[PDB]
Amino acid sequence: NSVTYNTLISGLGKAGRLEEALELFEEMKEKGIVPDVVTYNTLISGLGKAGRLEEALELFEEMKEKGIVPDVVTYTTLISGLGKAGRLEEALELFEEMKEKGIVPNVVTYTTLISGLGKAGRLEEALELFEEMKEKGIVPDVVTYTTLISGLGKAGRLEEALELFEEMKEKGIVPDVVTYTTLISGLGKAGRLEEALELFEEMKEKGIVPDVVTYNTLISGLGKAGRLEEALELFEEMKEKGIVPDVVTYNTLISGLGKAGRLEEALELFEEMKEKGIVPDVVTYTTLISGLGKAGRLEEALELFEEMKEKGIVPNVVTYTTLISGLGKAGRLEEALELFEEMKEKGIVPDVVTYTTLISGLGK
DNA sequence: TTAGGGTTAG
């Protein structure tokens, strides 16, 4: 029964049925049968990817207590989850713990830390870790390079991101659609959309086929350069090439339309995505709430905020800030303050944007 | 057989 139950949970986890996997896991522990490390790693990954990091860390504690020894996969998964949640110090603490326990980190472990460091803007530390990895005889692959290229591009260090891309090719590491898309994004964000479009052409000529993420990146870049009509033309064509738009495609176009004040069309796409089975998320609702509030349609923005909660979508700091900005600009400071208090009550931490927005409203 | 990279909102 131990092997059958473990294969089942590991199977369900692989199939993305986390709650069903968790159920059989509890059921196997009720019947006193011991879960294996693959089962624990699968559940820890699922929980981490669902944002349920405290539950992931609880399972990590549970396997240690039950005498199930964490391996490189266990630590790498948790380091990934902690890093994605901006909990860099804890991710690094876990990396120091695995090393003290004689568990050998590999290229995946190091790439995961490089990613978490780069996302927290600690790019120099990511560059130093990349040098450290090489000194230990760990060979970076296409994923490791792409990770750093992304960190560099996000800090607007495009000349260094392209230098690293050239170094990578010089070492015989072949770029894939992800490497090219990363650069297309970086270029597009640094006001170099034309270079990004030339690189997209050079990518295709090298036999690299774009995926939906490549298209979403081009759509984003076009919109930012005041070329929303070309973004919409690319989307209206995207379907013909067989590429299926996803939640991000819709979120990006909704943002572009909403920023241009073309709110009716943004809402048309919101209805179109729902008809096509594409499920709106926190980004979809927050983008529309911002579009509505900025166009003076504050009551609609507040009603959409109610709708979002009713659909089980959890508002974040971005959602609260856009409404605080909306309420503040309309002179509804009492409501903006209550919302600032409600957000704090839900454990949502304000950032500099939240503070400066609220001060601007109260200061008028 | 579980773990790493690219896209979107204030």
Side-chain angles (χ1 to χ4, degrees), chain A residues 295-327:
Chain A
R297 304 177 191 179
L298 193 58
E299 282 316 300
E300 288 97 319
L302 289 166
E303 284 175 344
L304 204 63
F305 179 64
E306 300 170 2
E307 177 69 5
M308 179 190 196
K309 294 170 170 173
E310 291 179 1
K311 291 269 155 155
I313 312 297
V314 185
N316 60 203
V317 71
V318 190
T319 326
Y320 281 98
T321 306
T322 184
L323 280 172
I324 286 158
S325 177
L327 290 163

PDB file of all heavy atoms in Angstrom, chain A residues 295-327:
ATOM      1  N   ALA A 295     -10.839  56.968 -15.136  1.00  0.00           N
ATOM      2  CA  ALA A 295     -11.839  57.587 -16.014  1.00  0.00           C
ATOM      3  C   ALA A 295     -13.002  58.250 -15.228  1.00  0.00           C
ATOM      4  O   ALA A 295     -13.970  58.709 -15.834  1.00  0.00           O
ATOM      5  CB  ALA A 295     -12.381  56.559 -16.994  1.00  0.00           C
ATOM      6  N   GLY A 296     -12.881  58.312 -13.902  1.00  0.00           N
ATOM      7  CA  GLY A 296     -13.880  58.914 -13.023  1.00  0.00           C
ATOM      8  C   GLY A 296     -15.001  57.980 -12.590  1.00  0.00           C
ATOM      9  O   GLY A 296     -15.787  58.335 -11.695  1.00  0.00           O
ATOM     10  N   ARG A 297     -15.055  56.758 -13.200  1.00  0.00           N
ATOM     11  CA  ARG A 297     -16.060  55.715 -12.926  1.00  0.00           C
ATOM     12  C   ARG A 297     -15.700  54.969 -11.632  1.00  0.00           C
ATOM     13  O   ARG A 297     -15.466  53.761 -11.642  1.00  0.00           O
ATOM     14  CB  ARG A 297     -16.172  54.762 -14.129  1.00  0.00           C
ATOM     15  CG  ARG A 297     -16.498  55.502 -15.434  1.00  0.00           C
ATOM     16  CD  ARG A 297     -16.549  54.619 -16.655  1.00  0.00           C
ATOM     17  NE  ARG A 297     -16.598  55.433 -17.876  1.00  0.00           N
ATOM     18  CZ  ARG A 297     -16.630  54.955 -19.118  1.00  0.00           C
ATOM     19  NH1 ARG A 297     -16.656  53.644 -19.335  1.00  0.00           N
ATOM     20  NH2 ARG A 297     -16.648  55.784 -20.152  1.00  0.00           N
ATOM     21  N   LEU A 298     -15.654  55.706 -10.521  1.00  0.00           N
ATOM     22  CA  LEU A 298     -15.244  55.187  -9.216  1.00  0.00           C
ATOM     23  C   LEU A 298     -16.245  54.209  -8.620  1.00  0.00           C
ATOM     24  O   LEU A 298     -15.818  53.235  -8.003  1.00  0.00           O
ATOM     25  CB  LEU A 298     -14.918  56.333  -8.236  1.00  0.00           C
ATOM     26  CG  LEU A 298     -14.177  55.976  -6.939  1.00  0.00           C
ATOM     27  CD1 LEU A 298     -12.842  55.285  -7.217  1.00  0.00           C
ATOM     28  CD2 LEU A 298     -13.966  57.211  -6.095  1.00  0.00           C
ATOM     29  N   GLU A 299     -17.561  54.451  -8.799  1.00  0.00           N
ATOM     30  CA  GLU A 299     -18.583  53.530  -8.293  1.00  0.00           C
ATOM     31  C   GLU A 299     -18.482  52.166  -8.974  1.00  0.00           C
ATOM     32  O   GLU A 299     -18.578  51.139  -8.294  1.00  0.00           O
ATOM     33  CB  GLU A 299     -19.990  54.100  -8.441  1.00  0.00           C
ATOM     34  CG  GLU A 299     -20.346  55.129  -7.389  1.00  0.00           C
ATOM     35  CD  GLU A 299     -19.956  54.779  -5.968  1.00  0.00           C
ATOM     36  OE1 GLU A 299     -20.423  53.741  -5.444  1.00  0.00           O
ATOM     37  OE2 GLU A 299     -19.161  55.547  -5.383  1.00  0.00           O
ATOM     38  N   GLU A 300     -18.233  52.169 -10.290  1.00  0.00           N
ATOM     39  CA  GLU A 300     -18.020  50.961 -11.084  1.00  0.00           C
ATOM     40  C   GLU A 300     -16.773  50.224 -10.590  1.00  0.00           C
ATOM     41  O   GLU A 300     -16.838  49.016 -10.397  1.00  0.00           O
ATOM     42  CB  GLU A 300     -17.869  51.287 -12.573  1.00  0.00           C
ATOM     43  CG  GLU A 300     -19.188  51.711 -13.214  1.00  0.00           C
ATOM     44  CD  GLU A 300     -19.366  53.213 -13.304  1.00  0.00           C
ATOM     45  OE1 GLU A 300     -19.014  53.926 -12.333  1.00  0.00           O
ATOM     46  OE2 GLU A 300     -19.882  53.677 -14.344  1.00  0.00           O
ATOM     47  N   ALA A 301     -15.667  50.963 -10.325  1.00  0.00           N
ATOM     48  CA  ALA A 301     -14.408  50.384  -9.829  1.00  0.00           C
ATOM     49  C   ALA A 301     -14.644  49.667  -8.479  1.00  0.00           C
ATOM     50  O   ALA A 301     -14.163  48.543  -8.288  1.00  0.00           O
ATOM     51  CB  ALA A 301     -13.352  51.477  -9.683  1.00  0.00           C
ATOM     52  N   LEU A 302     -15.416  50.301  -7.576  1.00  0.00           N
ATOM     53  CA  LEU A 302     -15.760  49.749  -6.258  1.00  0.00           C
ATOM     54  C   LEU A 302     -16.657  48.517  -6.400  1.00  0.00           C
ATOM     55  O   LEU A 302     -16.493  47.555  -5.654  1.00  0.00           O
ATOM     56  CB  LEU A 302     -16.444  50.800  -5.359  1.00  0.00           C
ATOM     57  CG  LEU A 302     -15.572  51.945  -4.815  1.00  0.00           C
ATOM     58  CD1 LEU A 302     -16.439  53.056  -4.243  1.00  0.00           C
ATOM     59  CD2 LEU A 302     -14.585  51.444  -3.758  1.00  0.00           C
ATOM     60  N   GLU A 303     -17.594  48.537  -7.367  1.00  0.00           N
ATOM     61  CA  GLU A 303     -18.467  47.392  -7.625  1.00  0.00           C
ATOM     62  C   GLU A 303     -17.659  46.233  -8.210  1.00  0.00           C
ATOM     63  O   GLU A 303     -17.918  45.086  -7.870  1.00  0.00           O
ATOM     64  CB  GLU A 303     -19.611  47.776  -8.567  1.00  0.00           C
ATOM     65  CG  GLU A 303     -20.677  48.582  -7.846  1.00  0.00           C
ATOM     66  CD  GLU A 303     -21.807  49.112  -8.702  1.00  0.00           C
ATOM     67  OE1 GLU A 303     -21.659  49.136  -9.946  1.00  0.00           O
ATOM     68  OE2 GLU A 303     -22.835  49.534  -8.122  1.00  0.00           O
ATOM     69  N   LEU A 304     -16.683  46.531  -9.078  1.00  0.00           N
ATOM     70  CA  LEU A 304     -15.842  45.484  -9.657  1.00  0.00           C
ATOM     71  C   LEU A 304     -14.944  44.856  -8.583  1.00  0.00           C
ATOM     72  O   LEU A 304     -14.641  43.658  -8.660  1.00  0.00           O
ATOM     73  CB  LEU A 304     -15.009  46.018 -10.829  1.00  0.00           C
ATOM     74  CG  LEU A 304     -14.550  44.980 -11.848  1.00  0.00           C
ATOM     75  CD1 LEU A 304     -15.746  44.318 -12.549  1.00  0.00           C
ATOM     76  CD2 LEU A 304     -13.635  45.621 -12.859  1.00  0.00           C
ATOM     77  N   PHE A 305     -14.529  45.671  -7.588  1.00  0.00           N
ATOM     78  CA  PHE A 305     -13.758  45.221  -6.422  1.00  0.00           C
ATOM     79  C   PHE A 305     -14.616  44.215  -5.590  1.00  0.00           C
ATOM     80  O   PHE A 305     -14.099  43.166  -5.208  1.00  0.00           O
ATOM     81  CB  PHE A 305     -13.303  46.432  -5.590  1.00  0.00           C
ATOM     82  CG  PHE A 305     -12.509  46.147  -4.333  1.00  0.00           C
ATOM     83  CD1 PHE A 305     -11.260  45.538  -4.404  1.00  0.00           C
ATOM     84  CD2 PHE A 305     -12.976  46.559  -3.091  1.00  0.00           C
ATOM     85  CE1 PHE A 305     -10.503  45.314  -3.247  1.00  0.00           C
ATOM     86  CE2 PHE A 305     -12.216  46.346  -1.934  1.00  0.00           C
ATOM     87  CZ  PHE A 305     -10.985  45.720  -2.020  1.00  0.00           C
ATOM     88  N   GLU A 306     -15.925  44.492  -5.414  1.00  0.00           N
ATOM     89  CA  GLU A 306     -16.898  43.598  -4.755  1.00  0.00           C
ATOM     90  C   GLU A 306     -16.991  42.292  -5.567  1.00  0.00           C
ATOM     91  O   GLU A 306     -16.895  41.217  -4.986  1.00  0.00           O
ATOM     92  CB  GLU A 306     -18.330  44.213  -4.684  1.00  0.00           C
ATOM     93  CG  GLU A 306     -18.473  45.522  -3.928  1.00  0.00           C
ATOM     94  CD  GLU A 306     -19.795  46.273  -4.044  1.00  0.00           C
ATOM     95  OE1 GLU A 306     -20.733  45.778  -4.715  1.00  0.00           O
ATOM     96  OE2 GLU A 306     -19.878  47.381  -3.464  1.00  0.00           O
ATOM     97  N   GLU A 307     -17.171  42.394  -6.915  1.00  0.00           N
ATOM     98  CA  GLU A 307     -17.289  41.257  -7.839  1.00  0.00           C
ATOM     99  C   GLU A 307     -16.059  40.333  -7.755  1.00  0.00           C
ATOM    100  O   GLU A 307     -16.207  39.116  -7.710  1.00  0.00           O
ATOM    101  CB  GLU A 307     -17.483  41.769  -9.284  1.00  0.00           C
ATOM    102  CG  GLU A 307     -17.555  40.696 -10.364  1.00  0.00           C
ATOM    103  CD  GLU A 307     -18.779  39.794 -10.393  1.00  0.00           C
ATOM    104  OE1 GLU A 307     -19.728  40.015  -9.606  1.00  0.00           O
ATOM    105  OE2 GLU A 307     -18.789  38.865 -11.230  1.00  0.00           O
ATOM    106  N   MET A 308     -14.866  40.924  -7.763  1.00  0.00           N
ATOM    107  CA  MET A 308     -13.576  40.259  -7.685  1.00  0.00           C
ATOM    108  C   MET A 308     -13.538  39.324  -6.442  1.00  0.00           C
ATOM    109  O   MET A 308     -13.218  38.149  -6.582  1.00  0.00           O
ATOM    110  CB  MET A 308     -12.520  41.354  -7.586  1.00  0.00           C
ATOM    111  CG  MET A 308     -11.155  40.892  -7.470  1.00  0.00           C
ATOM    112  SD  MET A 308     -10.088  42.458  -7.033  1.00  0.00           S
ATOM    113  CE  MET A 308      -8.553  41.715  -7.439  1.00  0.00           C
ATOM    114  N   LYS A 309     -13.906  39.848  -5.259  1.00  0.00           N
ATOM    115  CA  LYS A 309     -13.958  39.097  -3.997  1.00  0.00           C
ATOM    116  C   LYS A 309     -14.975  37.947  -4.072  1.00  0.00           C
ATOM    117  O   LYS A 309     -14.687  36.850  -3.586  1.00  0.00           O
ATOM    118  CB  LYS A 309     -14.331  40.025  -2.832  1.00  0.00           C
ATOM    119  CG  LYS A 309     -13.296  41.087  -2.499  1.00  0.00           C
ATOM    120  CD  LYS A 309     -13.929  42.049  -1.507  1.00  0.00           C
ATOM    121  CE  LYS A 309     -12.951  43.002  -0.901  1.00  0.00           C
ATOM    122  NZ  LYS A 309     -13.646  44.027  -0.077  1.00  0.00           N
ATOM    123  N   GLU A 310     -16.148  38.197  -4.709  1.00  0.00           N
ATOM    124  CA  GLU A 310     -17.231  37.213  -4.885  1.00  0.00           C
ATOM    125  C   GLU A 310     -16.841  36.038  -5.783  1.00  0.00           C
ATOM    126  O   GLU A 310     -17.393  34.942  -5.638  1.00  0.00           O
ATOM    127  CB  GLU A 310     -18.520  37.885  -5.374  1.00  0.00           C
ATOM    128  CG  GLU A 310     -19.139  38.765  -4.302  1.00  0.00           C
ATOM    129  CD  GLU A 310     -20.404  39.519  -4.662  1.00  0.00           C
ATOM    130  OE1 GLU A 310     -20.891  39.382  -5.809  1.00  0.00           O
ATOM    131  OE2 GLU A 310     -20.905  40.257  -3.786  1.00  0.00           O
ATOM    132  N   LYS A 311     -15.878  36.269  -6.684  1.00  0.00           N
ATOM    133  CA  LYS A 311     -15.312  35.285  -7.603  1.00  0.00           C
ATOM    134  C   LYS A 311     -14.110  34.575  -6.939  1.00  0.00           C
ATOM    135  O   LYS A 311     -13.437  33.773  -7.579  1.00  0.00           O
ATOM    136  CB  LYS A 311     -14.878  35.973  -8.921  1.00  0.00           C
ATOM    137  CG  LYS A 311     -16.050  36.475  -9.773  1.00  0.00           C
ATOM    138  CD  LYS A 311     -16.536  35.444 -10.771  1.00  0.00           C
ATOM    139  CE  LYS A 311     -17.976  35.673 -11.134  1.00  0.00           C
ATOM    140  NZ  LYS A 311     -18.289  35.123 -12.473  1.00  0.00           N
ATOM    141  N   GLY A 312     -13.848  34.900  -5.677  1.00  0.00           N
ATOM    142  CA  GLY A 312     -12.759  34.325  -4.897  1.00  0.00           C
ATOM    143  C   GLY A 312     -11.384  34.862  -5.227  1.00  0.00           C
ATOM    144  O   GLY A 312     -10.383  34.245  -4.853  1.00  0.00           O
ATOM    145  N   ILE A 313     -11.312  36.018  -5.922  1.00  0.00           N
ATOM    146  CA  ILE A 313     -10.029  36.634  -6.255  1.00  0.00           C
ATOM    147  C   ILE A 313      -9.595  37.510  -5.066  1.00  0.00           C
ATOM    148  O   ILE A 313     -10.361  38.355  -4.599  1.00  0.00           O
ATOM    149  CB  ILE A 313     -10.077  37.409  -7.610  1.00  0.00           C
ATOM    150  CG1 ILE A 313     -10.732  36.584  -8.764  1.00  0.00           C
ATOM    151  CG2 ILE A 313      -8.718  37.953  -8.002  1.00  0.00           C
ATOM    152  CD1 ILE A 313     -10.066  35.297  -9.200  1.00  0.00           C
ATOM    153  N   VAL A 314      -8.392  37.263  -4.548  1.00  0.00           N
ATOM    154  CA  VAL A 314      -7.867  37.981  -3.390  1.00  0.00           C
ATOM    155  C   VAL A 314      -7.147  39.268  -3.815  1.00  0.00           C
ATOM    156  O   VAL A 314      -6.134  39.198  -4.510  1.00  0.00           O
ATOM    157  CB  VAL A 314      -6.973  37.098  -2.460  1.00  0.00           C
ATOM    158  CG1 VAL A 314      -6.545  37.871  -1.209  1.00  0.00           C
ATOM    159  CG2 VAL A 314      -7.683  35.811  -2.066  1.00  0.00           C
ATOM    160  N   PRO A 315      -7.634  40.450  -3.380  1.00  0.00           N
ATOM    161  CA  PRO A 315      -6.915  41.696  -3.710  1.00  0.00           C
ATOM    162  C   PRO A 315      -5.542  41.750  -3.057  1.00  0.00           C
ATOM    163  O   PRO A 315      -5.375  41.227  -1.963  1.00  0.00           O
ATOM    164  CB  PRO A 315      -7.812  42.805  -3.143  1.00  0.00           C
ATOM    165  CG  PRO A 315      -8.719  42.149  -2.202  1.00  0.00           C
ATOM    166  CD  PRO A 315      -8.832  40.706  -2.557  1.00  0.00           C
ATOM    167  N   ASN A 316      -4.572  42.378  -3.719  1.00  0.00           N
ATOM    168  CA  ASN A 316      -3.227  42.557  -3.178  1.00  0.00           C
ATOM    169  C   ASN A 316      -2.949  44.066  -2.976  1.00  0.00           C
ATOM    170  O   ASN A 316      -3.879  44.866  -3.111  1.00  0.00           O
ATOM    171  CB  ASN A 316      -2.175  41.843  -4.034  1.00  0.00           C
ATOM    172  CG  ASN A 316      -2.054  42.281  -5.479  1.00  0.00           C
ATOM    173  OD1 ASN A 316      -1.569  41.534  -6.334  1.00  0.00           O
ATOM    174  ND2 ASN A 316      -2.405  43.510  -5.786  1.00  0.00           N
ATOM    175  N   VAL A 317      -1.704  44.445  -2.655  1.00  0.00           N
ATOM    176  CA  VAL A 317      -1.289  45.841  -2.416  1.00  0.00           C
ATOM    177  C   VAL A 317      -1.587  46.751  -3.629  1.00  0.00           C
ATOM    178  O   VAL A 317      -1.964  47.893  -3.437  1.00  0.00           O
ATOM    179  CB  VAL A 317       0.187  45.957  -1.931  1.00  0.00           C
ATOM    180  CG1 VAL A 317       1.193  45.639  -3.039  1.00  0.00           C
ATOM    181  CG2 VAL A 317       0.459  47.327  -1.311  1.00  0.00           C
ATOM    182  N   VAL A 318      -1.421  46.233  -4.848  1.00  0.00           N
ATOM    183  CA  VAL A 318      -1.690  46.940  -6.102  1.00  0.00           C
ATOM    184  C   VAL A 318      -3.204  47.276  -6.171  1.00  0.00           C
ATOM    185  O   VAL A 318      -3.549  48.436  -6.394  1.00  0.00           O
ATOM    186  CB  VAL A 318      -1.172  46.164  -7.354  1.00  0.00           C
ATOM    187  CG1 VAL A 318      -1.248  47.031  -8.600  1.00  0.00           C
ATOM    188  CG2 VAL A 318       0.270  45.680  -7.146  1.00  0.00           C
ATOM    189  N   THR A 319      -4.081  46.284  -5.920  1.00  0.00           N
ATOM    190  CA  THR A 319      -5.540  46.466  -5.892  1.00  0.00           C
ATOM    191  C   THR A 319      -5.972  47.539  -4.897  1.00  0.00           C
ATOM    192  O   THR A 319      -6.768  48.413  -5.244  1.00  0.00           O
ATOM    193  CB  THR A 319      -6.302  45.144  -5.636  1.00  0.00           C
ATOM    194  OG1 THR A 319      -5.616  44.041  -6.228  1.00  0.00           O
ATOM    195  CG2 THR A 319      -7.739  45.203  -6.146  1.00  0.00           C
ATOM    196  N   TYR A 320      -5.458  47.476  -3.659  1.00  0.00           N
ATOM    197  CA  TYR A 320      -5.829  48.472  -2.649  1.00  0.00           C
ATOM    198  C   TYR A 320      -5.318  49.871  -2.996  1.00  0.00           C
ATOM    199  O   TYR A 320      -6.041  50.844  -2.814  1.00  0.00           O
ATOM    200  CB  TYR A 320      -5.375  48.038  -1.248  1.00  0.00           C
ATOM    201  CG  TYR A 320      -6.290  47.004  -0.625  1.00  0.00           C
ATOM    202  CD1 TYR A 320      -5.978  45.647  -0.675  1.00  0.00           C
ATOM    203  CD2 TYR A 320      -7.444  47.383   0.052  1.00  0.00           C
ATOM    204  CE1 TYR A 320      -6.823  44.690  -0.110  1.00  0.00           C
ATOM    205  CE2 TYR A 320      -8.291  46.435   0.625  1.00  0.00           C
ATOM    206  CZ  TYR A 320      -7.974  45.090   0.544  1.00  0.00           C
ATOM    207  OH  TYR A 320      -8.814  44.153   1.096  1.00  0.00           O
ATOM    208  N   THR A 321      -4.089  49.966  -3.498  1.00  0.00           N
ATOM    209  CA  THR A 321      -3.471  51.248  -3.858  1.00  0.00           C
ATOM    210  C   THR A 321      -4.235  51.970  -4.966  1.00  0.00           C
ATOM    211  O   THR A 321      -4.419  53.187  -4.879  1.00  0.00           O
ATOM    212  CB  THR A 321      -1.982  51.081  -4.185  1.00  0.00           C
ATOM    213  OG1 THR A 321      -1.349  50.434  -3.077  1.00  0.00           O
ATOM    214  CG2 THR A 321      -1.286  52.420  -4.449  1.00  0.00           C
ATOM    215  N   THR A 322      -4.689  51.226  -5.989  1.00  0.00           N
ATOM    216  CA  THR A 322      -5.431  51.851  -7.092  1.00  0.00           C
ATOM    217  C   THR A 322      -6.748  52.428  -6.612  1.00  0.00           C
ATOM    218  O   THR A 322      -7.127  53.513  -7.058  1.00  0.00           O
ATOM    219  CB  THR A 322      -5.571  50.939  -8.324  1.00  0.00           C
ATOM    220  OG1 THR A 322      -6.225  51.720  -9.329  1.00  0.00           O
ATOM    221  CG2 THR A 322      -6.407  49.695  -8.065  1.00  0.00           C
ATOM    222  N   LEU A 323      -7.420  51.748  -5.670  1.00  0.00           N
ATOM    223  CA  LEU A 323      -8.662  52.259  -5.116  1.00  0.00           C
ATOM    224  C   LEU A 323      -8.431  53.418  -4.163  1.00  0.00           C
ATOM    225  O   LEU A 323      -9.200  54.378  -4.195  1.00  0.00           O
ATOM    226  CB  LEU A 323      -9.468  51.152  -4.465  1.00  0.00           C
ATOM    227  CG  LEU A 323     -10.267  50.270  -5.429  1.00  0.00           C
ATOM    228  CD1 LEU A 323     -10.841  49.124  -4.703  1.00  0.00           C
ATOM    229  CD2 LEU A 323     -11.427  51.048  -6.071  1.00  0.00           C
ATOM    230  N   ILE A 324      -7.352  53.364  -3.353  1.00  0.00           N
ATOM    231  CA  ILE A 324      -6.975  54.465  -2.453  1.00  0.00           C
ATOM    232  C   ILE A 324      -6.722  55.715  -3.320  1.00  0.00           C
ATOM    233  O   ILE A 324      -7.282  56.771  -3.027  1.00  0.00           O
ATOM    234  CB  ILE A 324      -5.755  54.090  -1.555  1.00  0.00           C
ATOM    235  CG1 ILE A 324      -6.192  53.092  -0.455  1.00  0.00           C
ATOM    236  CG2 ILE A 324      -5.108  55.351  -0.947  1.00  0.00           C
ATOM    237  CD1 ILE A 324      -5.052  52.246   0.142  1.00  0.00           C
ATOM    238  N   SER A 325      -5.954  55.560  -4.420  1.00  0.00           N
ATOM    239  CA  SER A 325      -5.699  56.639  -5.381  1.00  0.00           C
ATOM    240  C   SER A 325      -7.010  57.214  -5.957  1.00  0.00           C
ATOM    241  O   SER A 325      -7.169  58.435  -5.990  1.00  0.00           O
ATOM    242  CB  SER A 325      -4.801  56.154  -6.511  1.00  0.00           C
ATOM    243  OG  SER A 325      -4.633  57.207  -7.441  1.00  0.00           O
ATOM    244  N   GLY A 326      -7.931  56.331  -6.365  1.00  0.00           N
ATOM    245  CA  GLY A 326      -9.229  56.720  -6.912  1.00  0.00           C
ATOM    246  C   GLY A 326     -10.077  57.484  -5.919  1.00  0.00           C
ATOM    247  O   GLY A 326     -10.547  58.583  -6.227  1.00  0.00           O
ATOM    248  N   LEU A 327     -10.262  56.914  -4.711  1.00  0.00           N
ATOM    249  CA  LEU A 327     -11.033  57.513  -3.623  1.00  0.00           C
ATOM    250  C   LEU A 327     -10.444  58.861  -3.180  1.00  0.00           C
ATOM    251  O   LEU A 327     -11.199  59.816  -3.005  1.00  0.00           O
ATOM    252  CB  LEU A 327     -11.135  56.555  -2.425  1.00  0.00           C
ATOM    253  CG  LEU A 327     -12.005  55.314  -2.608  1.00  0.00           C
ATOM    254  CD1 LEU A 327     -11.693  54.287  -1.553  1.00  0.00           C
ATOM    255  CD2 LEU A 327     -13.498  55.668  -2.591  1.00  0.00           C
TER     256      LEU A 327
END
